[PDB]
């Protein structure tokens, strides 16, 4: 994921299938190469609750 | 015509408490600055509540907080603005301000008034509260404190915490717990 | 003072400032103040041929009661002869 | 007999009950902070209740109170005057002014007049009915104010007939009626003696004639008076032979402005508490049902307060303020507990204020009230506009429609038709590169000769330097031609005329449909402000005006020295000191342009302060034009900050600093040719068209020959204080027209002149 929504787009294939290991690789707008024009703290700062609530995603924090 | 326009930009339906959603409590308090610099005394408005981090709530006469609404209205951005192709940085403020449901401006300079009056009054019937008689502690709304460790009245006290003074909320729920439990009005869009 | 009397005075005043008119310059951003600010006018109407002075109290407006305007809850409404009859006249559409 | 009432003072706490009792919660009558309470129009009612209800009571009016009708009831503000207020002491007077016996009964019709302070405040009237048969022939009366009959005298015969009547009667017998405007403004007061036969008719009113300012002056009088009369003779003729003047007008569709539900109270004790109207008929059953009615009816009077609360909420938008007259007509009977949608509507204008009509209906949807209300315009402000947007044919769709646009430019047509030979109207209708006046038998060489009057005079040190404006016209003179490569229509001269007809003729319309507030404030830019002088104040005859601003524009076209191909030695340029820099402010370009100004020892000044920070106006000498436009120029490619300059250097040491920008620019505009070009900036527009510096100092010189023109123009009588004071804010000035010895100071201060100086010096001429 790579915005608010995307981020929403991955807790909702997690739901899909609760028992599957998910690793959510959470970039930010300051990575490498592809890029983005999203921040790297706010997104997740946001999200992070509702993230949390599922046992199958693997929060994982990149770039930078 | 303010009730007219204030509808037609989906805000509330005027009354003496605004509530900005998303915005620093130094942010609100400087467009009320604004605000106020243009009216004189008895039609300013203040912050009432800080519900929180970036909630708050502005009260004054409606017609002077529906003023801040006008400068307000122009400061935001239409919600499906879709700034994601625009840096961060400089993307423009989104955010939500609406009229809540009350007849009165509660923790207002409006009511003052109303202070001595009302305590006058609690005497004249059998009412007070002794700090001896409460039996757990009932956390003071602007301090945060104990209502017991108090020297003068507490009466008086919540008087004129709910009539004058501001709401810390979140400094006046300091304690910890496991468990708040919710007695006060509206389901699930109350204060708990 | 004698009714009369005013007149006379306030008649040569007014023939005065009519005369010098000719060499002393326009004051229009200060009388547009005048009536916007201390007059507080919501409806400045402009009759001429096109909307020239109109555009000029607009723009008057945004530069400086950007502010005064939205605290004051005063709706301003800024109307040229030329080209906004329906509103001068208060006849509509439907 | 008029009936005294009693002096009143207005309780802050009278209030509070009445607004309850009625159900008016507009904030103008509520307590707040920093305020003085506010009285509802409607509290005259129980102020001057007892004063009012006293005139139906005599025994030469005999009447069963029990039978007693209320038909209706309204209040008219007296103009000027101030709504009630909670500190104020009233005064009633209620006089009765018409009681006349009719088939179904007998009618009387009261008049209250609250004053306060000495001055009247506002008229209540009521009328009342006490159903039965009658026939006091004896004592019955009845006083009607006639509408205005206007009457054009136009023939010979028309002043015959007039004169042969013998209620005309006029001051000056010798007066020369022919040609002129009459109106009657006419009050007739009959007594009857039978059932259809009068007693007495006696109708008497003023005669007044209009003047070229279309003010009216007072001619004569109507003074008739018959016994055993059968008719008003007098109305009679004035109907048949003349038309009558309504104030209202009607708009084209009515304006729907909303429709509202309302209650009457659960009782009427309330409501009687607070207006003394103790009648047993609303409040005790057994009175009630003596008088055979319904039920305990509701107070009329609360319908009419309560209806009155929702045209002052929906129509004033809670400005209390701004209603200034309401009336209402009791249509049938409500009971305690009835739901009522009243409905209004905007039906029309009267002399600025909205008409505006309303219609009670019930349950069963049957009428029960029905009246109107006259209501302010918001705060309104006529600007007329200047030169320079002139258009071929401008405001001739309104010459073909209005009437009062018809009589404006055709006063005006024929005024320059007839002494300068030329149509204004054809000039404007279409737009004629040349046009030749031909001087030809006795009529042309009557225009001629005021052309060749035409002078432009030049005190110069002392001395009068004065020149023809026609330099060629002479005793032998068979034509002259103005000529414009473009079109007359955009030269001065006829531009001015046009404009100010145009605009004229457009506010006379506006005039005539009741769209104009009386307390209107009003200011012309330039040229506009003789047209704005002309449509509010009427300072001056529609031929007076386009006499003036055609000479104004003769002698801008004369007032600097011409070239062969008649070329101007200045210009104007338009500025915009936001585009040369963000930085560079007011005190910005006056600082610039007043040093270009001293160091070229040429001309600049800025003549149109137009809007701060972003549009003014240079004129002067079109090299110093040049030099402006070009030191602005490097300014902005420079990013020079002047008021940081300011701060960090000296006064001296920056003044230098621009001197040599200044320098260096000024040096390579007085070595370009004799009439320079004037271009383009990056906040510079060069005005074309314009030749002459005027709103500079250049123009000091042609101000006392133009200063004895506007004198020889602009009557002392037709300068109406009033129309002027507050709401005129001239050009010289920026500041509302008042005559104070403050005000006049300044004048002396912006111009020097000898008239003012005098007054300024001795301003307590005061005492007659």
Known sequence: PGSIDAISQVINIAKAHPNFPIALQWTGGRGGGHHSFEDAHTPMLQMYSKIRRHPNIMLIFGSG | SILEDSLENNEGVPSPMLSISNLTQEQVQDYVNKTNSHLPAGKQVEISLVNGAKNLVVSGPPQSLYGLNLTLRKAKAPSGLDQSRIPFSERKLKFSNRFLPVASPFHSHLLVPASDLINKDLVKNNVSFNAKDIQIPVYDTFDGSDLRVLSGSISERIVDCIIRLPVKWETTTQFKATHILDFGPGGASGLG | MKPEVEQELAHILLTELLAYQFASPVRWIETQDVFLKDFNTERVVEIGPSPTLAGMAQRTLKNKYESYDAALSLHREILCYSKDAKEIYYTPDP | ?768
């Not at chain 4, 007693?68 to 709504?83: C, E, Q, T």
């Not at chain 4, 088939?103 to 302070?117: A, F, Y």
């Not at chain 4, 007939?161 to 009050?187: H, P």
């Not at chain 4, 008929?281 to 319908?303: C, D, E, K, Q, W």
Request: aromatic residues 10%; proline residues 4%; hydrophobic residues 40%.
């Open chain 4, 1 to 768: 007999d008029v009936i005294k009432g009693k002096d009143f003072e207005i309780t802050a706490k009278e209030v509070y009950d009445f607004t309850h009792a009625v159900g008016n919660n507009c904030e103008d009558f509520v307590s707040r902070p920093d305020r003085t309470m506010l009285a509802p129009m409607d509290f005259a009612i129980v102020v001057g209740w007892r004063a009012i209800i006293k005139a139906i009571f005599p025994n030469t009016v005999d009447g069963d109170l029990l039978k007693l009708v209320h038909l209706s009831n309204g209040y008219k503000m007296i103009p000027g005057a101030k709504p009630l207020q909670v500190g104020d002491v009233v005064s009633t007077t209620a006089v009765i002014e018409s009681v006349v016996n009719q088939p179904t009964g007998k009618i009387v019709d009261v008049v209250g007049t609250l004053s306060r302070n000495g001055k009247p405040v506002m008229e209540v009237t009521s009328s009342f009915f006490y159903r039965g048969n009658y026939t006091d022939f004896e004592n019955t009366f009845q006083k009607t104010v006639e509408p205005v009959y206007q009457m054009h005298i136009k023939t010979s015969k028309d002043i015959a007939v007039l004169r042969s009547k013998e209620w005309f009667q006029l001051d000056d017998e010798d007066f020369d009626l022919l040609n002129k405007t009459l109106t009657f403004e006419t009050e007739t007061e009959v007594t009857f003696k039978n059932a259809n036969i009068f007693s007495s008719v006696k109708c008497f009113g003023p005669i007044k004639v209009e003047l070229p300012t279309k003010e009216t002056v007072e001619i004569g009088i109507v003074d008739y008076e018959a016994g055993a009369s059968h008719g008003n003779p007098v109305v009679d003729f004035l109907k048949r032979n003349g038309s009558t003047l309504e104030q209202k007008v009607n708009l084209e569709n009515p304006i729907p402005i909303a429709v509202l539900d309302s209650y009457t109270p659960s009782t009427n004790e309330p409501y009687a508490r607070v207006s003394g109207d103790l009648n047993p008929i609303h409040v005790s059953r057994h009175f009630a049902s003596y008088a055979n009615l319904p039920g305990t009816i509701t107070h009329g009077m609360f319908s009419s307060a309560s209806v009155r609360a929702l045209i002052e909420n929906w129509a004033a938008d809670s400005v209390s303020s701004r209603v200034r007259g309401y009336t209402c007509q009791f249509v049938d009977m409500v009971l305690p507990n009835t739901a009522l949608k009243t409905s209004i509507q905007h039906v029309g204008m009267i002399n600025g204020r909205k008409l505006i009509k309303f219609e009670t209906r019930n349950e069963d949807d049957v009428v029960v009230l029905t009246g109107e209300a006259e209501i302010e315009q918001p705060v309104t402000t006529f600007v007329f506009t200047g030169q320079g947007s002139q258009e071929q044919g401008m405001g001739m769709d309104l010459y073909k429609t209005s009437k009062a646009a018809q009589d404006v430019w055709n006063r005006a047509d024929n005024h320059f038709k007839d002494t300068y030979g030329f149509s204004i109207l054809d000039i404007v209708i279409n737009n004629p590169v040349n046009l030749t006046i031909h001087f030809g038998g006795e009529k042309g060489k009557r225009i001629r000769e005021n052309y060749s009057a035409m002078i432009f005079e030049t005190i110069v040190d002392g001395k009068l330097k004065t020149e023809k404006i026609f330099k060629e016209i002479n005793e032998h003179s068979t034509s002259y031609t103005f000529r414009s490569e473009k079109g007359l229509l955009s030269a001065t001269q006829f531009t001015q005329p046009a404009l100010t007809l145009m605009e004229k003729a457009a506010f006379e319309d506006l005039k005539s449909k009741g769209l104009i507030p009386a307390d209107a404030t009003f200011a012309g830019h330039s040229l506009g402000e003789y047209a704005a002088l002309a449509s509010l104040a009427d300072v001056m005859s529609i031929e007076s005006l386009v006499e003036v601003v055609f000479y104004r524009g003769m002698t801008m076209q004369v007032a600097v020295p011409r070239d062969e191909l008649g070329r101007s030695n200045y210009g104007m340029i338009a500025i915009n000191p936001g585009r040369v820099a963000a930085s560079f402010s007011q005190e910005a370009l006056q600082y610039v342009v007043e040093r270009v100004g001293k160091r070229t020892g040429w001309l600049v000044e800025i003549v149109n302060y137009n809007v701060e920070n972003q549009q003014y106006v240079a004129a002067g000498d079109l090299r110093a034009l040049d030099t402006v436009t070009n030191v602005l120029n490097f300014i902005k490619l420079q990013k020079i900050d002047i008021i940081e300059l300011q701060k960090s250097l000296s006064l001296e040491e920056v003044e230098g600093h621009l001197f040599e920008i200044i320098d260096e620019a000024s040096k390579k505009s007085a070595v370009k040719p004799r009439p320079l070009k004037l271009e383009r900036g990056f906040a510079c527009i060069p005005l074309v068209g314009i030749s002459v510096p005027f709103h500079s100092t250049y123009l000091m010189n042609g101000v006392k020959p133009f200063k004895s023109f506007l004198k020889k123009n602009i009557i002392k009588e037709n300068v109406k204080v009033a129309r002027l004071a507050g709401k005129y804010i001239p050009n010289l000035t920026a500041k509302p027209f008042q005559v104070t010895k403050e005000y006049f100071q300044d004048v002396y201060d912006l111009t020097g002149s000898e008239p003012i100086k005098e007054i300024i010096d001795n301003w307590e001429k005061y005492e007659q």
